[PDB]
Amino acid sequence: SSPHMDRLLGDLKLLAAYDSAAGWQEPKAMESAFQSLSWDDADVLKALPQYLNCRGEQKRRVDFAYAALCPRPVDEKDPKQTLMSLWMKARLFSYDQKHPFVLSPFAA
Amino acid sequence: SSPHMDRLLGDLKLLAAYDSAAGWQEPKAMESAFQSLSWDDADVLKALPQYLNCRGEQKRRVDFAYAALCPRPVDEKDPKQTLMSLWMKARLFSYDQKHPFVLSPFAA
Amino acid sequence: AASTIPISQWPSLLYAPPSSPANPAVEALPEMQFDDLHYPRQMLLCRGAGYSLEQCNRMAQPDARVTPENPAEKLLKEEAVAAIACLSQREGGKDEQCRYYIERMYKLANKE
Amino acid sequence: VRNQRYPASPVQEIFLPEPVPFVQFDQTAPSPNSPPAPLPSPSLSQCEEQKDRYRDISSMFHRGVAGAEQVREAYNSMAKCFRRVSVAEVLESDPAFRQARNFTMDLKQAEDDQRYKQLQYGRVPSILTKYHL
Amino acid sequence: SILGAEAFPELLSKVPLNPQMDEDKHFNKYKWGNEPIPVNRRTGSRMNSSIYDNRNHEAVRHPWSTDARTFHPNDNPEADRINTQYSNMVSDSFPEGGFSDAPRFSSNWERLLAYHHGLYSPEKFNSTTKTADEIRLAVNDFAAKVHADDPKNACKYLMIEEFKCLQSAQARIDPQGAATKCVKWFNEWRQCAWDQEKMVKGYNYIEDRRARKHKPYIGAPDLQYS
Amino acid sequence: VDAREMKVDMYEKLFKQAADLENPCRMPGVAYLRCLRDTLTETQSARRSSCLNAFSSFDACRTGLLKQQSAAVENSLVRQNMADVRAKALFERRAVLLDLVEGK
Amino acid sequence: MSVFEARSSFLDLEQCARAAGPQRWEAECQGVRQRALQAAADVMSRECGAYGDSFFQCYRHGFRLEACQGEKATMQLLRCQRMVADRLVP
Amino acid sequence: MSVFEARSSFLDLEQCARAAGPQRWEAECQGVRQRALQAAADVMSRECGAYGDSFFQCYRHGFRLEACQGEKATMQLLRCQRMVADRLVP
Numbered sequence: 001s002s003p004h005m006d007r008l009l010g011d012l013k014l015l016a017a018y019d020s021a022a023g024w025q026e027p028k029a030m031e032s033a034f035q036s037l038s039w040d041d042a043d044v045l046k047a048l049p050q051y052l053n054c055r056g057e058q059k060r061r062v063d064f065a066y067a068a069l070c071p072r073p074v075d076e077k078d079p080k081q082t083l084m085s086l087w088m089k090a091r092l093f094s095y096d097q098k099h100p101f102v103l104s105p106f107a108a
Numbered sequence: 109s110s111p112h113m114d115r116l117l118g119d120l121k122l123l124a125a126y127d128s129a130a131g132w133q134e135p136k137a138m139e140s141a142f143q144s145l146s147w148d149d150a151d152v153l154k155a156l157p158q159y160l161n162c163r164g165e166q167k168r169r170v171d172f173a174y175a176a177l178c179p180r181p182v183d184e185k186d187p188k189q190t191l192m193s194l195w196m197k198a199r200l201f202s203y204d205q206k207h208p209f210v211l212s213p214f215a216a
Numbered sequence: 217a218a219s220t221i222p223i224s225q226w227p228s229l230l231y232a233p234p235s236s237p238a239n240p241a242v243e244a245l246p247e248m249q250f251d252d253l254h255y256p257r258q259m260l261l262c263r264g265a266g267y268s269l270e271q272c273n274r275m276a277q278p279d280a281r282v283t284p285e286n287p288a289e290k291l292l293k294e295e296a297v298a299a300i301a302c303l304s305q306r307e308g309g310k311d312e313q314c315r316y317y318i319e320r321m322y323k324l325a326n327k328e
Numbered sequence: 329v330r331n332q333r334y335p336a337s338p339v340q341e342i343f344l345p346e347p348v349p350f351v352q353f354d355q356t357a358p359s360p361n362s363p364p365a366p367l368p369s370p371s372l373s374q375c376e377e378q379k380d381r382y383r384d385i386s387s388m389f390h391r392g393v394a395g396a397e398q399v400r401e402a403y404n405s406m407a408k409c410f411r412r413v414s415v416a417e418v419l420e421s422d423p424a425f426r427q428a429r430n431f432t433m434d435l436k437q438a439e440d441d442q443r444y445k446q447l448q449y450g451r452v453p454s455i456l457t458k459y460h461l
Numbered sequence: 462s463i464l465g466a467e468a469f470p471e472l473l474s475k476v477p478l479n480p481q482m483d484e485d486k487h488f489n490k491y492k493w494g495n496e497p498i499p500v501n502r503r504t505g506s507r508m509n510s511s512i513y514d515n516r517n518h519e520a521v522r523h524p525w526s527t528d529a530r531t532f533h534p535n536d537n538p539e540a541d542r543i544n545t546q547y548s549n550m551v552s553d554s555f556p557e558g559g560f561s562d563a564p565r566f567s568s569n570w571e572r573l574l575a576y577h578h579g580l581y582s583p584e585k586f587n588s589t590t591k592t593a594d595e596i597r598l599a600v601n602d603f604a605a606k607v608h609a610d611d612p613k614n615a616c617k618y619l620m621i622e623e624f625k626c627l628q629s630a631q632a633r634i635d636p637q638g639a640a641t642k643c644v645k646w647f648n649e650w651r652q653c654a655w656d657q658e659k660m661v662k663g664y665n666y667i668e669d670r671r672a673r674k675h676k677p678y679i680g681a682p683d684l685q686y687s
Numbered sequence: 688v689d690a691r692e693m694k695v696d697m698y699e700k701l702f703k704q705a706a707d708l709e710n711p712c713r714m715p716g717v718a719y720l721r722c723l724r725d726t727l728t729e730t731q732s733a734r735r736s737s738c739l740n741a742f743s744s745f746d747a748c749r750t751g752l753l754k755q756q757s758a759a760v761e762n763s764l765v766r767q768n769m770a771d772v773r774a775k776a777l778f779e780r781r782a783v784l785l786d787l788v789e790g791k
Numbered sequence: 792m793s794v795f796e797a798r799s800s801f802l803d804l805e806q807c808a809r810a811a812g813p814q815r816w817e818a819e820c821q822g823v824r825q826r827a828l829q830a831a832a833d834v835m836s837r838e839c840g841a842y843g844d845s846f847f848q849c850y851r852h853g854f855r856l857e858a859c860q861g862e863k864a865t866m867q868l869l870r871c872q873r874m875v876a877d878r879l880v881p
Numbered sequence: 882m883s884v885f886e887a888r889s890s891f892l893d894l895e896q897c898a899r900a901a902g903p904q905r906w907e908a909e910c911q912g913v914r915q916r917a918l919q920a921a922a923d924v925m926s927r928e929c930g931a932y933g934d935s936f937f938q939c940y941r942h943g944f945r946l947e948a949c950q951g952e953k954a955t956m957q958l959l960r961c962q963r964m965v966a967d968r969l970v971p
Contacts, residue, residue, distance in 0.1 A: 002869065006467035009846070009865055013471050016853045017478045021491075022238035023546045029477060029490045030237065035308030036474040045304055052293060056373055057277070063285065064278035071594050073244045073283050079299065079321040081238055082288045086296060099828070104255045104276045106269060110959065117936070117955055124943050135349040142351075150414035157424035184447045188352060207918070216882075218542045220535075221550045224642065226629040227622070230593055230600075234545050249605070250598050257711055261744070264751035265384055384743045397732075398739050465869045469862060478854045485860075503857065548853065558856040592851050609714050 004095065007038050011088060014038075015070070018084070034080055037087065044087060047094035051086075054093065061101050062093050112203065115146050119196060123178065126192070142188055145195065152195060155202035162201065169209050170200045247284060254279040288325065295321050361434060369420070370412040378406040493543060498552060505532030506562045510638070524575055525564045532556055547593040555631055559589045584633050596628040616653035622646045691727045695720055712748035719745050797830035797879055831879050839871035887920035887969055921969050929961035 014033045021030035038044075051062065066089050074081040095101075122141045129138035146152070159170065174197050182189040203209075221229055231245050255276060262272040289296070299317040306313035334340040382402035388394035419425045470476065477483035480495035507521040508531040520529035535553040542549070551557065563586045566572045575581035591599075603624045607617055623646035632639030658664075676683050699720045706713040719741035726734045804820065804827045811819045836843075846868055849859035858864065894910065894917045901909040926933075936958055939949035948954065 010470045022236045023544045032476045036470045039303040039308045067282040073241045077325040135351045148411040150418045218545045227625045260751035261747045264747035
């Protein structure tokens with residue numbers, strides 16, 4: 001009844017788990033986290049190629065939101081990190097194109 | 109609020125400056141003049157290929173006006189001169205096809 | 217083996233962290249940025265120009281001075297899309313089902 | 329105030345005089361054998377500091393402490409930024425420039441062509457055609 | 462209608478967010494197990510540290526009632542500290558959730574008076590530790606602002622370094638402790654300021670002739686110094 | 688030109704002592720004074736074209752600060768007056784309740 | 792932005808929907824829909840912002856804090872959102 | 882060709898435009914538009930011909946003369962045209 005919210009929070013929890021397992025040197029835990037990361041979402045899958053070709057204001061909004069949630073720059077060489085970044089960005093792009101983001105504190 | 113007039117007068121000033129700088133042997137000044145010559149005008153750019161293929165009365169009108177403003181024949185070998193001539197002719201062609209010229213003194 | 221890092225060495229730990237299975241770009245850690253003053257500064261400038269709150273909120277835009285995008289997202293686009301297709305089909309790559317695409321990406325990115 | 333071309337004029341003018349300049353290109357550098365790469369197409373995302381600065385300076389000229397030079401400069405920068413996108417639209421849309429965008433040619437072909445034979449100026453008609461004779 | 466069905470993949474798939482969760486829920490996906498962070502390192506109160514204080518290793522006294530059980534830093538750590546990231550290192554000297562010394566004021570004038578007398582800042586008392594990412598963002602913004610202020614300044618990176626050290630030492634919550642770490646870079650900046658001024662304004666002095674025993678031994682080399 | 692350099696140095700010293708790095712107008716002010724340093728050996732007419740880009744941001748931040756000060760004064764006055772009126776009403780309520788109170 | 796305003800927004804939405812019909816509602820009633828959703832969103836953010844900020848903080852600290860242990864950090868937020876919806880839309 | 886005639890031309894234009902409407906004006910009112918513009922152009926040439934001839938002369942002499950120094954040769958013409966427009970169209 002709240003799938004978008006639920007999957008968002010799950011993704012965030014799994015990202016935190018991946019980071020913790022990486023810090024603690026736990027391949028089993030971090031691979032479990034990678035596998036459990038909601039890869040079966042049709043909306044995000046459909047929005048992935050849309051995000052990969054978007055440009056301008058929408059891209060800047062999604063980049064701002066992604067840098068808010070995850071400002072650390074992932075290693076360009078690690079495809080698992082790259083892919084999880086792409087998945088989260090596609091999720092945010094889907095949410096934004098459904099209901100755009102309002103990032104300013106000033107609003108009415 | 110007077111873009112056509114303003115750009116016309118600017119072009120004329122820059123032509124005079126180019127001729128003066130050529131007479132006084134000033135490559136820096138005359139290249140500055142060439143660079144400052146309103147090359148970013150969408151109307152003139154659109155009218156250029158129209159002028160290059162026009163024929164008959166419109167072409168004769170524009171040739172008459174260009175020979176009024178600039179009767180000296182440019183050197184066939186100097187592309188900068190050729191190009192500035194082309195740009196001025198395209199500007200006049202645009203002005204004429206928007207509002208045709210009335211060159212005769214007799215009129216009512 | 218992993219010895220304690222004293223408090224005096226933490227500034228070096230932030231920009232030269234130890235090795236992990238998931239490392240960051242140490243060369244790009246000085247380039248990660250996110251301005252908390254972006255929108256306040258924008259609002260201040262617009263209100264000094266003379267606008268109202270509604271006009272300022274309509275003119276507001278999110279910061280472009282943020283962390284740069286991963287170039288892998290533009291260079292390995294098709295490989296990443298294929299890997300994501302494989303993951304969506306094969307349940308996140310359980311028991312080594314996207315190893316093909318992941319190894320191709322790793323080789324392309326690393327080159328020995 | 330004049331900066332003499334030949335400060336040692338009775339010596340310098342005769343041997344090693346200055347030549348007539350050349351303004352088509354530098355002529356001291358190699359010739360590029362490839363055209364420029366197509367720049368990224370623009371849009372109104374990038375007129376930030378031109379629009380807002382022109383607004384600023386116009387509001388200040390409305391007060392009067394700004395000036396007119398300032399307005400001209402700001403307005404012309406803003407208009408250049410708009411003309412970028414207008415020119416991009418014209419080039420991408422109007423078909424006559426589709427051939428011109430993908431123009432490629434080399435100095436060997438330029439030297440092997442033979443159109444320079446036909447570069448002679450024509451001749452003005454006779455003045456009797458005015459009276460139709 | 463169940464609440465949060467799709468929101469606990471950590472529970473459905475036995476994924477622990479940390480070795481403490483692994484130990485608690487018995488997922489056993491951490492090969493190296495878990496050494497629990499004890500309570501005296503998970504929480505506590507600010508304490509005095511210096512040996513030249515009489516109330517050393519004693520809790521800081523406030524106008525309000527506060528638990529006097531102190532945060533105890535890791536003084537005898539184990540040899541292998543497998544996670545050497547900032548996340549796990551900061552726990553040896555500060556609690557991640559902040560100190561347990563925060564007030565709940567019955568009134569606004571008590572808050573006003575404490576601030577006026579220098580005994581309260583919410584920055585200090587109602588706050589957590591800063592994450593490495595936050596620290597890096599702050600440091601990079603400060604460096605950008607300083608470079609914009611002046612590129613041709615020799616004290617630039619020294620100022621940036623004292624900022625970095627304050628952020629890393631969590632000066633929002635332990636300013637005295639952080640200043641104890643950062644005053645060295647402040648001193649270096651203080652030196653660089655004069656070193657720059659004397660280069661800008663040409664300031665020099667008459668050096669005396671060389672001493673008879675400048676060299677300790679005749680066969681010794683006299684390395685020349687500017 | 689030497690006295691111009693001295694005036695700009697005085698401006699920079701004064702403004703840097705006045706405005707700290709947290710101040711928003713610091714970067715625009717320093718930029719404007721750096722442009723003045725760039726264009727010392729010039730006339731005001733030639734200097735305007737070059738220093739406009741920094742003076743615009745400086746004037747904007749400046750007027751923003753002024754508006755902030757004005758708004759702060761106004762809001763503080765309003766809040767103070769509301770609080771005092773409420774306190775007075777509470778005092779009169781206490782007075783009537785002390786007229787109604789009963790006992791010894 | 793207030794609960795009263797959001798409730799009036801949803802009443803406008805429902806009555807205009809009954810006016811339009813089940814076939815052209817999404818076409819005719821977009822502005823009222825956006826207004827209603829924005830008011831409900833303001834209410835939700837106001838009444839559930841503390842829990843969202845707490846989840847954000849736990850996420851920054853990797854759910855290492857005492858209050859992040861378990862699932863209360865998520866269940867509190869979801870319960871707040873569910874309560875807000877049940878209070879607004881019906 | 883006179884200011885009175887041009888003013889009457891523009892009044893014809895505006896009243897016929899109010900008659901036609903904002904949708905078909907450019908279609909219906911072309912002849913009156915051309916007449917009005919031609920009359921305004923006659924007025925402009927009559928009242929600003931001296932400045933135009935002066936600019937033409939300066940251009941022939943490369944702006945080397947005394948009266949060509951500065952920007953008055955252009956500003957005078959633009960001011961004449963602006964004044965004529967402000968006198969005619971509003």
